[PDB]
Structure formats: structure tokens, C-alpha cells
Amino acid sequence: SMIDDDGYRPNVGIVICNRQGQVMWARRFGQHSWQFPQGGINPGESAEQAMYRELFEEVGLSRKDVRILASTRNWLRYKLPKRLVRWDTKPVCIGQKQKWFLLQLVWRWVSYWYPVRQVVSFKRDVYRRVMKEFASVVM
Ligand SMILES: [Ca+2]
């Protein structure tokens, strides 16, 4: 994933829901690391392409297994806390620009809003923004 001219790293995120309104989250890295699937967008690659790559890698699913219900048409941008920035590597990455996808099936299930409260502190505000946007699709 290449850093853009503003210093943002492009990423994709996936929210898979079921017909009961639960959402899926998976261990990003080992025990207790439950998070929505998320990964970088590489050069010469659309967000949708990156989404299917992350879906296959994290969940073992492909396009046939899911229906896209919604996505962020533009970017969800946020700045890293300054103490998380890798200040000695150029170009310096100061944030992420993210495209999120809401999927439904054609890891564990939790209530839709549960991840907003329970995810690691660093991603709570991003999760709140994402789930608020997708609320207009599912509520
Ligand atoms: Ca990933």
C-alpha cells in the first residue's frame, strides 16, 4: 500500500452482516484481537478488488458467497494519533483513507453496535462513523 501525496495510506474495511442484524468480526492478530477485516489497497487496484482479497484472506470467502449492500463512495479519512506515527521513515504516513464495504452472506457474530463500544480504543471513532453511515442502509 502506497502513501498518497497528503500522507494517507489507502485501506479497505469489511462489515459482514447476517439477516438477524448481527455483524462478523475476526481475530486480526491472535487472541482477543477481534476486529472487522481490514487491509491495504495496493497500486493499480480498486477498493473492490482489495476488498475481495481481504475477504478471501481473512474469512476464506469469495464474491459468490457475499452480496454487497453498500460502500463508501469516497474516502473516510482520519489522522493517526501523533505518538503512533513512524516519524523516521519517509514518506511519513500520518493517517489512513478508508473505503468500507457492507456485505451480507448469500470468526464470531456480535450485535451491530457492539464493535463500536468493544473494539480497541484506537478504532472506536472510525467504527462509530462506519456503522452510523451503514445504519441508513439497514435500519
Ligand atoms: Ca487484513
UniProtKB/Swiss-Prot annotation:
Pfam family, one: NUDIX
GO biological process: mRNA catabolic process; NAD-cap decapping; RNA decapping; RNA destabilization; tRNA processing
pH dependence: Optimum pH is 8.5-9.0.
Alphabetical keyword list: Hydrolase, Magnesium, Manganese, tRNA processing, Zinc
GO MF, any single term: hydrolase activity, acting on acid anhydrides, in phosphorus-containing anhydrides
Broad class of enzyme this protein falls into: hydrolase
Cofactor comment: Magnesium or zinc. Manganese can be used to a lesser extent.
Listed EC numbers: 3.6.1.-
Tree of life domain: Bacteria
GO cellular component terms given for this protein: cytoplasm
Motif (Nudix box): 39-60
Cofactor or coenzyme needed: Mg(2+); Zn(2+); Mn(2+)
Effect of residue 54 to A: Loss of function
PROSITE patterns to which the protein is assigned, alphabetical: NUDIX, NUDIX_BOX
Disruption phenotype: Altered 5'-processing of primary pre-tRNA transcripts with short (<5 nucleotides) leaders; in the presence of the truncated inactive allele encoded by rph in strains derived from K12 W1485, including strains MG1655 and W3110. In the presence of wild-type (catalytically active) RNase PH no effect on processing. No effect on growth rate, a slightly stronger effect is seen when combined with the inactive rph allele.
Domain (Nudix hydrolase) ranges: 7-132
SUPFAM superfamilies: Nudix
Subunit structure comment from the entry: Monomer. No interaction between this protein and catalytically inactive RNase PH was detected by immunoprecipitation.
Function: Master regulator of 5'-end-dependent mRNA decay. Accelerates the degradation of transcripts by removing pyrophosphate from the 5'-end of triphosphorylated RNA, leading to a more labile monophosphorylated state that can stimulate subsequent ribonuclease cleavage. Preferentially hydrolyzes diadenosine penta-phosphate with ATP as one of the reaction products. Also able to hydrolyze diadenosine hexa- and tetra-phosphate. Has no activity on diadenosine tri-phosphate, ADP-ribose, NADH and UDP-glucose.
Name of the protein in its database record: RNA pyrophosphohydrolase
Lineage: Bacteria, Pseudomonadati, Pseudomonadota, Gammaproteobacteria, Enterobacterales
Gene name, Swiss-Prot/TrEMBL: rppH
